[PDB]
Amino acid sequence: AKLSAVRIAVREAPYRPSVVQFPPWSDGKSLIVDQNEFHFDHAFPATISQDEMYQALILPLVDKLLEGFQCTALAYGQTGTGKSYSMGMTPPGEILPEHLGILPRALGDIFERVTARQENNKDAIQVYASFIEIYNEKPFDLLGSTPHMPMVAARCQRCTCLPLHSQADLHHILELGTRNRRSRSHAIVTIHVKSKTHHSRMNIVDLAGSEGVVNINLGLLSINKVVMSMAAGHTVIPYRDSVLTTVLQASLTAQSYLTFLACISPHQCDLSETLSTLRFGTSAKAAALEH
Numbered sequence: 001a002k003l004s005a006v007r008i009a010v011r012e013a014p015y016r017p018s019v020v021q022f023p024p025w026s027d028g029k030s031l032i033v034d035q036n037e038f039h040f041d042h043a044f045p046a047t048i049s050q051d052e053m054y055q056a057l058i059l060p061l062v063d064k065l066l067e068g069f070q071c072t073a074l075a076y077g078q079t080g081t082g083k084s085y086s087m088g089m090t091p092p093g094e095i096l097p098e099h100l101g102i103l104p105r106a107l108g109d110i111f112e113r114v115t116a117r118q119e120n121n122k123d124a125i126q127v128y129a130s131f132i133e134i135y136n137e138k139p140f141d142l143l144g145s146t147p148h149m150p151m152v153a154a155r156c157q158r159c160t161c162l163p164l165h166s167q168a169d170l171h172h173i174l175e176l177g178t179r180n181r182r183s184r185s186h187a188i189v190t191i192h193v194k195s196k197t198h199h200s201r202m203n204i205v206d207l208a209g210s211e212g213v214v215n216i217n218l219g220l221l222s223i224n225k226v227v228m229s230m231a232a233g234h235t236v237i238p239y240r241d242s243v244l245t246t247v248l249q250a251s252l253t254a255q256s257y258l259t260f261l262a263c264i265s266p267h268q269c270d271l272s273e274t275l276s277t278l279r280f281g282t283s284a285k286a287a288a289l290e291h
């Protein structure tokens with residue numbers, strides 16, 4: 001079948017004249033770059049805080065995750081545009097409160113709802129985290145004993161999930177994974193919600209820089225093909241088109257959720273990279289149709 005929802009958001013990175021224009025009159029989901037008009041589900045200016053961005057874009061997915069639906073939030077775009085910052089890939093301990101990203105905020109709300117529903121509980125719920133890195137189209141388990149050893153025919157499921165009981169634990173897995181981490185390197189930190197009969201995932205994806213100079217991009221790219229193939233029901237999904245779509249195969253299924261976060265530079269010198277990132281958003285936006 002089709003995914004439950006495919007959403008696309010854009011976040012303007014802080015300015016160091018911005019090429020990004022937010023029209024005086026708009027629905028808050030539009031922007032203009034190099035005279036081109038872009039329309040997505042969310043358009044966040046450089047002034048949007050982490051809290052607001054998380055509340056608008058990710059918080060809604062928390063209930064879905066708890067209900068058993070697979071969820072994926074993926075940041076993409078040029079290096080230095082705030083992808084890691086937005087997703088919260090840096091160990092929480094060494095981060096100021098207002099700067100905390102999506103990962104720590106999501107985990108916080110997950111624990112809260114799990115503790116609030118652990119009495120009108122059917123079964124018990126346990127939370128875990130996995131940290132996978134894709135270096136040159138090769139999956140690596142950053143939480144295992146061989147973080148520098150490629151995976152095959154098992155990166156889809158067989159990969160260490162470490163227990164999560166508090167933010168401190170998240171800090172541990174992020175610190176551990178970061179150390180065991182080694183010309184593109186993508187990161188996929190997944191919050192796993194497991195019960196005796198259910199397993200839902202919240203995949204927080206932080207892709208490597210999309211700038212140029214199979215083709216650097218290709219994942220997400222491959223992601224759009226997957227989204228389309230499912231809609232038109234090609235009765236064969238190109239999951240193996242890339243390591244990204246292979247690792248997230250279990251999450252790229254019917255009544256799963258996919259949310260894109262395009263991070264863009266407001267600098268004129270990055271116009272070309274920004275346009276590339278926004279054009280991809282438009283394409284993923286069209287592929288999200290029929291879903």
Ligand SMILES: Nc1ncnc2c1ncn2[C@@H]1O[C@H](COP(=O)(O)OP(=O)(O)O)[C@@H](O)[C@H]1O
Nearest residue numbers: 013014046078079080081082083084085086263
């Ligand atoms: N919205 C923001 N608010 C404050 N600082 C930011 C913001 N976005 C990016 N930064 C800072 O800019 C730098 C690069 O952010 P980063 O996420 O590492 O870019 P990327 O991961 O896309 O290559 C880091 O210092 C980050 O804290």
Ligand SMILES: [Mg+2]
Nearest residue numbers: 083084085206
């Ligand atoms: Mg980064």
